[PDB]
Design a binder for this molecule. Structure first.
Ligand SMILES: OC[C@H]1O[C@H](O)[C@H](O)[C@@H](O)[C@@H]1O
Ligand SMILES: OC[C@H]1O[C@H](O)[C@H](O)[C@@H](O)[C@@H]1O
Lengths: 808, 808
């Protein structure tokens, strides 16, 4: 535990100091005595103690950026899926062993204390977690980078499983306070809504608006042992200063803007409140950007001093807002303001699913943001004039490329707005960025090919290796030193150890340790027992049809049915774990969760099966749980329909943590297999080309049903009520979608998936060879560090050079 | 400044320590550098530094009460009008001179920093401020006393004067945080609403309720230099743990319970939200009381270990709630539970005005608190049985004494509930307590004479002398030492100085210093100029008809009209200041404010008048402003209709601070005059007896109009639009009320008031004799220390002996 060298030194004076400050905070901050103090009090005493170590560096870092005046990177996102902060802070400041020793001497278990901290669950999934990894990597790469978002009072809902169904409860993450953030009410800014436009003597004026205040809360973002501490600024909605009682209560309405994260993953819902949130972040953020620009030494130098990165189209209003500020308030001519805006802004796309893309009704924008709609129209007219000049007489292209979508309800295509108003547009994996240029944004790619880039996603090896899997980090460091922690390509050195008996032993030893620990977590927290001598088969990710948890379900039932047909036949024991949240209004996703639990109700209680197969639904999947389960996983399920998962990042986490991957050639799965060698991945199923071929002739699920007796058996089990005897018709909607309305072709990959899974079991029967393939995976996961990703953003889009150079 | 000895020592190590901790907090707490730090940052750095000095004593005091196990005093109030905390803390801990020196050395003016702090304005007026003085005195008297209330997000509205009218804005006192309180989310308790009653096997059960959580916030309450730090616990409403988005937003509804203070002074409005607030405090508080009782060493010893003081009928639900807990949850028989309840509870009455008394509709109580209504009915039946036994056949007495008020809407009389359920009932001045026994509660007094007590109000000489008027505190200490600060009767020693030339000089010198300072405040904050060589004539208190700001208006116009009639005639120059808030729905009070400003619009701009007379409306009258204006006052206006002001406390503040009093024989005015000698007070107008005589024959305002030419002139000025030329009929409602519907007989005291005011001017023309009478006032203000009041509560009601003995 304390013997782990990647965890740093327990200096005698440092341990002394930590204990003193722990005790100081318990007394003065918590107002507690050792007689009444709870484990929670002790967590907070430690949190404040550790947080104190960020402050000096935090002040100096921001002073450094003022003095050096580097180009500043503003990462705008509606989501920051941060997770917990205590361990991350200790890791990045080299304090983990010292705090572990200090708390031990005080008679406390630091890991028990760590479990007390609430996740900052201010994200839905991959997009939100990407923002979080990016913040970490940008600090580690010494960039003057500023995360900007919303401080949701309630993050992603806490998931309860009750009667086998998902129940949602408010994620009250701030109940006991947040010891990391610093409230900055003095830097509160006004954000305007509604009102109307007056075009007058100077030009346009936005008047008669309703004001909502944006109160910033700043959170330190430590780089890895480089003395850099950057800032995440999250805005909180506040009623403006100035019958009676009802008027005071009605302050809640404005303040609702920052109340709760919209729980949609890869799905657009056009709620006005969501639009208000989106503008809230954009307006307040751009005020900071402009003010800071002005206090740095005329708007010709703006894109040399400012980069605005748009995480999806969610902060896309930054484009017309910047135009609004520059033209209406700063009084620049349109053309120069637009030159500045495009050079300043860049856009990252995260999906190709049409229903996941933002298309706001013009009426909503006209009412809420009349000046912005006017600016959008003008952007559109001039952009389409450029299209018309480049492609004379191509009228359909004009229609296709327009920011304005015609129809029953006229809408603004926010992605189109982003491409027009950005100098760079990127997808998040090679295949995805290619598909953007080929299909979705083909016309835009043809107009401006230089604009379109790829930035394959990454994950931080701090949180996602050193923090969550110190045992693996240690055995790696024992061989290759510690440099890999911020230079992950050095993991390639581990290929020299594929035949090393000691390393093979240790890789397997670490995995087993993680599996025992996760089993212990489930027993402690849920009284759920899992077979420690079973393959841990894990699919953790948001519940979506495209991600095909349903395909996993079909395979699980296949294993069950095969056991029942031939009970004497040996099979590799498995614990099949599926976890993830369904969006509250996503009926099918909610049914899918109930199916998983219902499958378990049969399988986990069939005495013929016993511990040979178990299916469990991991409740409340979130960042902190990912940190627990991923290091314990043997098999990583990455089985999206080819062409649907833009990148994935959970895949990267599994690869880095010693699981083998079963997956389709989709998103970053392709590059992962490329890095490791396809021989080291369990690749199966339709390629994008094959999916398109099925689309061309029409997908007929009935054909697969008719030709595959084992599939037929399962569908009939589902329909007849084998998995819901008390309500036979419970899964009729799932069965109907699969048979008649499956956009994601579950049946088409069933046979290949089942066969590929057989090969997984075949390799698992050979522990030595399983582990050797694992080594080949970990050793080639280096590309998927978010440091690599960020360095690319920095050099190819932002025009800044990253540096891992330590601050004094 | 720093030469003031009552402000303590500036120890060299102490000054060093304070500066170090100031700097430590600026760095680690505020995350600020001297380059970006504002005066507000510096205030907070000081506040945290000073607050740290409370902690050791706070922990030790509460440990002391656990060890000693004294009887605990629970002071239940819907209001705690605390004001600011920084200076009070420094005063009570003897740190003022040290902090003044420390900040000076840091290049800061501590008094500028003090002005940054928001008032904890969690009260309306006298009743709320009494609770605050009581907390201070109970700590100074070493009582194990616990203030319990609601942490309003918004206290008493901030008053703006715009176009001469009151405008209300939300009092966002927590905008920049509160460095004094300690949030205690770990001690959160459930409070129940609505639901229904099941009478079953064990008995009654309150079921199907809606839960609102009560989160306690604890604030230190330091005694005067005795090392005692008690606790004020204020509950905050929190939604319970467990479509989607709307459900999360609807958490606001439960949380609205603690959102805002109902801005009514001496007026009952029967809003359900107010009832919810009242029960919210009671339910959460009594849970603490019961739990603490159980952890002290069977409910026979409860009243020996618990006292519950009810500040007005606002927490009266404590009576049926205690019964509910003891009978329904603790399973005691009714009779024993009732014995306990009465012995535990005591009730303080603050008014005789019928519209100020709480009478809740039975339907509201039945819906919101069905079990409580049931218990109230049973309390009533048994109480009336006792009445019937004591007064056989007296049926009207039964009707009069019933807790249930019959009529169109059937109501519960909360005062009747309180008397029935309390072993002690007290009024707040001798005349008031007598009037209670004579009229309002006559029947109850006849049934249980022993129950009825007097506790004449008091004010704390810490906040109200040492803090607000250090100059006066010092010249007093120079003669008689410092013991008087917690033994105010020692001020009687000052009678030996009525002929002392040095003291006469210094008393006058201090007053002038305060007047210059207040003039400077008005110039700095409002660019309002006042004549420093004018008598400061001050009426500060909530705007009410009974308090008769209108009588003040009539006199002001009389002075104006007399000047205009005889411009050559010398008059003592006056600055007439009136300040105070009107309840938002109190139309007449709002008109009265507009009249004051409208009078000023004429008087302050008449060139014949010049600086001989000025009328100003003091905006946003609150605790911190009282601390500024009261020490600057020459004349204290205490002119309520005899029999209407229960006590007053503002009167006491003025007496202690060297103003002479013009007042009616009402409330504590009577005892003030008794203490000082009537010759030293400007007493005028109807006595209670005279008011009653007018009521018997009918008050005819027309008679006074017909007989007093000067009054007639003023009424005609008001009616014709002399004070509102742009809207002649503006004051028709005021004129109509005065002439036809005046419950408070303004005209009946006009002549005596004007004559008495002439005598004020006559004495003011003689500075020596003015000051000598002032000395006779300050010297006899000792009775009106809240220490005296609290000692009486302790000995006569709570059954505890006060002690000024220092903790180690
Ligand atoms: O780009 C970050 C992530 O965004 C979204 O969650 C996509 O669905 C996922 O494929 C991608 O990895
Ligand atoms: O008892 C405290 C105070 O309560 C109310 O404000 C009364 O109106 C006042 O007369 C009294 O002094």
């Amino acid at each position: 535990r304390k013997q782990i060298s990647v965890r740093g030194l327990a200096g005698v004076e440092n341990v002394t100091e930590l204990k003193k400050n722990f005790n100081r905070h318990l007394h003065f901050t918590l107002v507690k005595d050792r007689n009444v103090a709870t484990p929670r009090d002790y967590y907070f005493a430690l949190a404040h103690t550790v947080r104190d170590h960020l402050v000096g560096r935090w002040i100096r870092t921001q002073q450094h950026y003022y003095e050096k005046d580097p180009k500043r990177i503003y990462y705008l996102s509606l989501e920051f899926y941060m997770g917990r902060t205590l361990q991350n802070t200790m890791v990045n400041l080299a304090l983990e062993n010292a705090c572990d020793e200090a708390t031990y001497q005080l008679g406390l278990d630091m890991e028990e204390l760590e479990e007390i901290e609430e996740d900052a669950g201010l994200g839905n999934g991959g997009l939100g977690r990407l923002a979080a990894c990016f913040l970490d990597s940008m600090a580690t790469l010494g960039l003057a980078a500023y995360g900007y978002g919303i401080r949701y009072e309630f993050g992603i809902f806490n998931q309860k499983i009750c009667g086998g169904w998902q129940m949602e409860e408010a994620d009250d993450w701030l109940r006991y306070g947040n010891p990391w953030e610093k409230a900055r009410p003095e830097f509160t800014l006004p954000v305007h809504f509604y009102g109307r436009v007056e075009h007058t003597s100077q030009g346009a004026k936005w008047v008669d608006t309703q004001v909502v205040l944006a109160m910033p809360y700043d959170t330190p973002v430590p780089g890895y042992r480089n003395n850099v501490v950057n800032t995440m600024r999250l805005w909180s909605a506040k009623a403006p200063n100035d019958g009676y009682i009802q008027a005071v209560l009605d302050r809640n309405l404005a303040e609702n803007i920052s109340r709760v994260l919209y729980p949609n993953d890869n799905f657009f819902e056009g709620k006005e409140l969501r639009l208000k949130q989106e503008y809230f972040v954009v307006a307040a953020t751009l005020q900071d950007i402009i003010r800071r620009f002005k206090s740095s030494k005329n708007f010709d130098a703006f894109p040399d001093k400012v980069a605005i990165q748009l995480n999806d189209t969610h902060p896309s209003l930054a484009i017309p807002e910047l135009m609004r500020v520059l033209v209406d308030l700063e009084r620049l001519d349109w053309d120069k303001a637009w030159e500045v805006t495009v050079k300043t802004c860049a856009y990252t796309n995260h999906t190709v699913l049409p229903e996941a893309l933002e298309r706001w009704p013009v009426h909503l924008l006209e009412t809420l943001l009349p000046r912005h709609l006017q600016i959008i129209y003008e952007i559109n007219q001039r952009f389409l004039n450029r299209v018309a000049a480049a492609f004379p007489g191509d009228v359909d292209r004009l229609r296709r490329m327009s920011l304005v979508e015609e129809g029953a309800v006229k809408r603004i295509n926010m992605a189109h707005l982003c491409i027009a108003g950005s100098h760079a547009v990127n997808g998040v994996a090679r295949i995805h960025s290619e598909i953007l240029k080929k299909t979705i944004f083909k016309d835009f790619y043809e107009l401006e090919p230089h604009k379109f880039q790829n930035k394959t996603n990454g994950i931080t090896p701090r949180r996602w290796l050193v923090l969550c899997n110190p045992g693996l980090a240690e055995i790696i460091a024992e061989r290759i030193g510690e440099e890999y922690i911020s230079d992950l390509d050095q993991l390639r050195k581990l290929l020299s150890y594929v035949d090393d008996e000691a390393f093979i032993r240790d890789v397997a030893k670490v995995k087993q340790e993680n599996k025992l620990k996760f089993a212990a977590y489930l027993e402690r927290e849920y009284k759920v027992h899992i077979n420690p001598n079973s393959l841990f088969d894990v699919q953790v990710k948001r519940i979506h049809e495209y991600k095909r948890q349903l395909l996993n379900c079909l395979h699980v039932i296949t294993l069950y049915n095969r056991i029942k047909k031939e009970p004497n036949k040996f099979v590799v024991p498995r614990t099949v774990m599926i976890g993830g949240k369904a969006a509250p209004g996503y009926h099918m996703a909610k049914m899918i969760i109930k199916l998983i639990t219902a499958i378990g109700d049969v399988v986990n209680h069939d005495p013929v099966v016993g511990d040979r197969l178990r299916v469990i639904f991991l409740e409340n999947y979130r960042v902190s749980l990912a940190e627990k389960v991923i290091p314990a996983a043997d098999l990583s399920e990455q089985i999206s329909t080819a062409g649907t998962e833009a990148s994935g990042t959970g895949n990267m986490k599994f690869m880095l943590n010693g699981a083998l991957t079963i997956g389709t050639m989709d998103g970053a799965n392709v590059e992962m297999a490329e890095e490791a060698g396809e021989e080291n991945f369990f690749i199966f199923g339709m390629r994008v080309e094959d999916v398109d071929r099925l689309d061309q002739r029409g997908y007929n699920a009935q054909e697969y049903y008719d030709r595959i007796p084992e599939l037929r058996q399962i569908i009939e089990q589902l329909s007849s009520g084998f998995f819901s005897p008390k309500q036979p018709d419970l899964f009729k909607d799932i069965v109907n979608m699969l048979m008649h309305h499956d956009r994601f072709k579950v049946f088409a990959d069933y046979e290949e998936y089942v066969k590929c899974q057989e090969r997984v079991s075949a390799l698992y029967k050979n522990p030595r060879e399983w582990t050797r393939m694992v080594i080949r995976n970990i050793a080639t996961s280096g590309k998927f560090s978010s440091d690599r990703t960020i360095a690319q953003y920095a050099r190819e889009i932002w025009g800044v050079e990253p540096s891992r150079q330590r601050l004094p």
